[PDB]
């Protein structure tokens, strides 16, 4: 996998000392994610030799974190906030609806193959709740029932997220509700 | 050398000594799960709790006797109700998700969990005593799944001392085992299948419980039933 | 309720699906453990559909990729559970009258299960 | 006026979030056009390393990571002149529920951060710093990298800053979602390439942190506050706040209120002021407010609470504690149990799994109780046990996470025990009001 982009290893290994090659484990794992949708046992075997340690050690390290997936994820992996602040904004009703609709459990992937789901923790934008993070990019903030069907229908039409019109207005570091 | 008062006994003891080893040296006792002869102490399971005074001024929070060093003129209480009550609870927590295998479990009466359970557990307060508070579904996972032809691993039993994984990186230097996910869900696992290092057998002798077991001698006799014969291995010069 | 009885009945089923998928796609099914509240049941009665409590669909090396279990008869907050080891995915299936076996609001049908099993087998089996 | 700054004063000067939300606020040019790294320059050329410590020890700055430790003092522990490589680390793993102040400082005014770490770097003899940002903060990550490159170019970073014989570079390490990575000692292991477990603190980070070398760790807000402190004297900083809570704090409020979000304010301004003047007051009736982080014990919605000074002392001796200053209001329309049900299930999911007390205690016993009692499957007995578990855990774990899971529960019982006994005694689940539009 990383045989290809040698210029990437080069650069990231550079960020850390000669002895702490292990440091690279996180960012390497990271790439394999944003590229392939999920991390394969092979990738770990690789990253292992690559970073100078055992496949076991790298497995333990990878299975620790929440972002990395280890089973295939849809094109658009909706991660929903469920922590308190978003709960008082309706976070559960959203999750019920989003699931009930798509008919997918967390482990699964929609028939059409583009939607996985997963509850996550507080994403540090409580003021703009409820919040959804899509893949590895900017929060689709203030998911109202309406706004949601808009984010959904938008991706469902192939439209690249970073330019989908989201009905209603939603603030920056301060937000007005009406 | 340092002056340390355990409970009622006073003992001399080198400077970089463990409060734990202090206690045992004085001839006392404390629940011991994760620390081990020759392995790095970390205060993992939290059994070897004690109370400490150091001037008498009583430290606010209980300490992990296995990772706190001794200091000159230190009192170490290992009998206070406050202490027993704490060990009692810690034991309760350890047993909270365990699997109920004993009669069937190959760890026989040579199991650190049982012994300490009986030794310190079930706190006497001062009516029908309550053996178990936790009435929910226990943690169920993988079971009796052999890592190699010589070691059979039972994940359910494991108590998450760090003994085995810690041993591997330290003694042999062959990291072929380590916890997987996190929280109540973590477990011991591998990706180096044969258990490579020529020194894997030792994890069987360290594992406080019946998770890591000698498969070479699975289901032969219970541990007391055996006739022990101390001797010397003469396969090689050591 | 007597919905408890129906849950175990369904758990018997969930197991039958597992054994099916097992011999079907050529991969090992294994009873991981039997109910303690059966083993150490003595003169005491027992009218549960099976003894089997924890089961797995393991791979070539034995490493499980699917893990199912139901809660013992004497426990509280009963649920039948699915777990894809190594991949932080946990499913709690309950039972609703008339609707059936559900993971929340969504039904857990032989179809949906078999789907989950595959996703796991293909991506998570070591051998 | 006459004496001391504590809120909506006219002599209050916004510093940190001054430029946040202003079009093009991250450009190196936008920072210099507004008096950029000109403070970093002065300090490096004139004042000595130790001297800059004393100005911060003098300022009264306390760790804005929620900690609350005197940051001047903190740097005072770093080794003098020993020749070892020293590391500085920015704890941008902001992930404690209800807290989102550090996000926008990264997203919009990164150069402020960089300048801060330069100062702080020089202060502790750190030739290299790392910034650990949670892997959910996409924008902040993208922005930081950019800014670090710009600054690396025009010579504000690296080789030999400002002609002065001090060098300083930054690297950005993205995390991957795990609350625990925010414990300083855990952060080091995560970044260092290991499983994210907190370390044995008998051997401290100050003398052995990142790869064994003497490192120091400060929060985004802390390091950013270092810039205005070095600019307008420590005395300017100190003319703000209470007797032990000096400076300006970035408070943030969330939950059912008119306009939530971040509000820069002088340490000590009243909850009322924040909840009402800036945030524009609740939209529901409120019953309790979580003062600092999530890890802070809830307080009841009483007059005397609203009129309390948000400080590292007034909240202290009031039962709770000021964490990250990230308030969360809770409506009477949602059961207090339902709220803790949630918070604990968070810590339960977020535990690392080193401790028995936490791995099994909170993540095993505790969470399940709430489930029982919160489906009206609980009896009076259950409550009493959840009650008893607390003191068995709080005391001794390995890291403060468990403490964080038990306090807010402990606290909730202290002020709402009745709410728990209700759902139990009456076998009613928690209420499910409709909460989203
Ligand atoms: C369990 C635990 C979790 C923490 N999580 C965070 C966090 O998410 N974000 C953060 O900024 N600090 C967090 N901290 C605080 C770190 O200890 C903190 O960044 C460090 O003490 C800050 O230094 P400072 O307060 O001088 O800035 C956490 C601490 C603990 C013990
Ligand atoms: S590890 Fe010990 S306590 Fe556990 S079932 Fe086995 S013999 Fe019993
Ligand atoms: S397998 Fe045994 S030695 Fe290893 S962590 Fe589990 S209890 Fe400890
Ligand atoms: S208190 Fe919890 S999160 Fe902290 S070290 Fe212990 S098990 Fe890990
Ligand atoms: S609670 Fe959802 S972002 Fe903080
Ligand atoms: S033995 Fe000291 S805590 Fe485990
Ligand atoms: Ca090249
Ligand atoms: Ca197996």
UniProtKB/Swiss-Prot annotation, chain A:
Gene that encodes it: nqo2
Cofactor binding mode and count: Binds 1 [2Fe-2S] cluster. This [2Fe-2S] cluster is referred to as N1a.
Record's keyword terms, sorted: 2Fe-2S, Cell membrane, Disulfide bond, Iron, Iron-sulfur, Membrane, Metal-binding, NAD, Quinone, Translocase
Protein name stated in the entry: NADH-quinone oxidoreductase subunit 2
Record-linked NCBIfam families: nuoE_fam
Entry's free-text remark on domains: The subunit can be divided into two domains: an N-terminal four-helical bundle (residues 2 to 74) involved in interactions with subunits Nqo1 and Nqo3, and a thioredoxin-like C-terminal domain (residues 75 to 180) that coordinates the binuclear cluster N1a.
Entry superkingdom: Bacteria
Residues reported in the UniProt entry to bind [2Fe-2S] cluster: 81, 85-86, 122, 126
Cross-referenced CDD domains: TRX_Fd_NuoE
EC id: 7.1.1.-
Assigned GO CC terms: plasma membrane
UniProt keyword annotation of RNA-binding present: no
Reaction it catalyzes: a quinone + NADH + 5 H(+)(in) = a quinol + NAD(+) + 4 H(+)(out)
Subunit structure: NDH-1 is composed of 15 different subunits, Nqo1 to Nqo15. The complex has a L-shaped structure, with the hydrophobic arm (subunits Nqo7, Nqo8 and Nqo10 to Nqo14) embedded in the membrane and the hydrophilic peripheral arm (subunits Nqo1 to Nqo6, Nqo9 and Nqo15) protruding into the bacterial cytoplasm. The hydrophilic domain contains all the redox centers.
Intracellular or extracellular location(s): Cell membrane
Swiss-Prot record, chain B:
Record: residues binding [4Fe-4S] cluster 1: 98, 102, 105, 111
Binding site for [4Fe-4S] cluster 2: 158, 161, 164, 207
Domain 2Fe-2S ferredoxin-type: 1-82
Binding locations of [2Fe-2S] cluster: 34, 45, 48, 66
Entry's localization field: Cell membrane
Highest taxon listed in the record's lineage: Bacteria
Domain spans labelled 4Fe-4S His(Cys)3-ligated-type: 82-121
Binding, [4Fe-4S] cluster 3: 233, 236
Effect of substituting residue 233 to A: Decreases amount and stability of iron-sulfur center 4
Subunit relationships: NDH-1 is composed of 15 different subunits, Nqo1 to Nqo15. The complex has a L-shaped structure, with the hydrophobic arm (subunits Nqo7, Nqo8 and Nqo10 to Nqo14) embedded in the membrane and the hydrophilic peripheral arm (subunits Nqo1 to Nqo6, Nqo9 and Nqo15) protruding into the bacterial cytoplasm. The hydrophilic domain contains all the redox centers.
Purpose: NDH-1 shuttles electrons from NADH, via FMN and iron-sulfur (Fe-S) centers, to quinones in the respiratory chain. The immediate electron acceptor for the enzyme in this species is menaquinone. Couples the redox reaction to proton translocation (for every two electrons transferred, four hydrogen ions are translocated across the cytoplasmic membrane), and thus conserves the redox energy in a proton gradient required for the synthesis of ATP.
Family named by the database record: Belongs to the complex I 75 kDa subunit family.
Protein name: NADH-quinone oxidoreductase subunit 3
Organism, as annotated: Thermus thermophilus (strain ATCC 27634 / DSM 579 / HB8)
From Swiss-Prot, chain C:
Gene3D superfamilies: NADH-quinone oxidoreductase, subunit 15
Membrane topology, as annotated: Peripheral membrane protein
Root EC class: translocase
Compartments (UniProt record): Cell membrane
Cleavable signal peptide: none
Broad class of the protein's primary localization: membrane
Keywords: Cell membrane, Membrane, NAD, Quinone, Translocase
Matches recorded under InterPro entries: Frataxin/CyaY_sf, NADH_quinone_OxRdtase_su15, NADH_quinone_OxRdtase_su15_sf
EC number: 7.1.1.-
Pfam families, sorted: NADH_Oxid_Nqo15
Catalytic activity: a quinone + NADH + 5 H(+)(in) = a quinol + NAD(+) + 4 H(+)(out)
Biological-process GO terms, alphabetical: iron-sulfur cluster assembly
GO cellular component, one term: plasma membrane
GO MF: ferric iron binding; quinone binding
Highest taxon of the lineage: Bacteria
Role: NDH-1 shuttles electrons from NADH, via FMN and iron-sulfur (Fe-S) centers, to quinones in the respiratory chain. The immediate electron acceptor for the enzyme in this species is menaquinone. Couples the redox reaction to proton translocation (for every two electrons transferred, four hydrogen ions are translocated across the cytoplasmic membrane), and thus conserves the redox energy in a proton gradient required for the synthesis of ATP.
Domain notes: Has a similar fold to the mitochondrial iron chaperone frataxin.
Family from the record: Belongs to the complex I Nqo15 family.
Name under which the protein is recorded: NADH-quinone oxidoreductase subunit 15
Organism whose genome encodes this protein: Thermus thermophilus (strain ATCC 27634 / DSM 579 / HB8)
Lineage: Bacteria, Thermotogati, Deinococcota, Deinococci, Thermales
UniProtKB/Swiss-Prot annotation, chain D:
Catalytic activity: a quinone + NADH + 5 H(+)(in) = a quinol + NAD(+) + 4 H(+)(out)
MF terms in GO: 4 iron, 4 sulfur cluster binding; FMN binding; metal ion binding; NAD binding; NADH dehydrogenase (ubiquinone) activity; quinone binding
EC identifiers of the protein: 7.1.1.-
InterPro entries in UniProt: NADH-UbQ_OxRdtase_51kDa_CS, NADH-UbQ_OxRdtase_suF, Nuo51_FMN-bd, Nuo51_FMN-bd_sf, Nuop51_4Fe4S-bd, Nuop51_4Fe4S-bd_sf, Soluble_ligand-bd
Required co-factors: FMN; [4Fe-4S] cluster
Annotated keywords: 4Fe-4S, Cell membrane, Flavoprotein, FMN, Iron, Iron-sulfur, Membrane, Metal-binding, NAD, Quinone, Translocase
Keyword match Translocase: yes
Record's bilayer topology term: Peripheral membrane protein
Flavoprotein among keywords: yes
Cited NCBIfam families: nuoF_fam, PRK13596.1
Domains as described in the record: The subunit can be separated roughly into four domains: an N-terminal domain (residues 7 to 72) ending with a glycine-rich loop, followed by a Rossman-fold domain (73 to 240), a ubiquitin-like domain (241 to 335) and a C-terminal four-helical bundle containing cluster N3 (336 to 438).
Protein name listed in UniProt: NADH-quinone oxidoreductase subunit 1
Organism whose genome encodes this protein: Thermus thermophilus (strain ATCC 27634 / DSM 579 / HB8)
Gene that this polypeptide is encoded by: nqo1
